[PDB]
Amino acid sequence: QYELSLNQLDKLRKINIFNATFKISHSGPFATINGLRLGSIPESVVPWKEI
Amino acid sequence: NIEMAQLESNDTINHSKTELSLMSQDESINDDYGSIYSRFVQIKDRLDQ
Numbered sequence: 001q002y003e004l005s006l007n008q009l010d011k012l013r014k015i016n017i018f019n020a021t022f023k024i025s026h027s028g029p030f031a032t033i034n035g036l037r038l039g040s041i042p043e044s045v046v047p048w049k050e051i
Numbered sequence: 052n053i054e055m056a057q058l059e060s061n062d063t064i065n066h067s068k069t070e071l072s073l074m075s076q077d078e079s080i081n082d083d084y085g086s087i088y089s090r091f092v093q094i095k096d097r098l099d100q
Contacts, residue, residue, distance in 0.1 A: 001096065
């Protein structure tokens with residue numbers, strides 16, 4: 001139970017970021033938003049409905 | 052007479068061994084620590100809840 005409590009503490013430290021949902025990070029050459037790849041290069045293009 | 056002395060020695064051995072092996076006092080520490088941990092849990096878990 002205490003382990004679950006500490007896990008809830010870490011989950012709170014992550015809960016401080018709760019404002020970030022749609023938030024975009026950088027993956028590969030491009031930057032993806034909330035797990036959605038945007039932009040297409042000459043090598044591997046992405047889907048239209050994905051964009 | 053040796054049997055009577057053996058009786059007294061048997062009672063003595065039994066009582067001494069019983070008192071020395073487990074006095075039940077050692078469990079009080081784990082009980083206190085467990086109670087404190089129970090308070091800390093009942094506090095922190097509900098707070099995080």
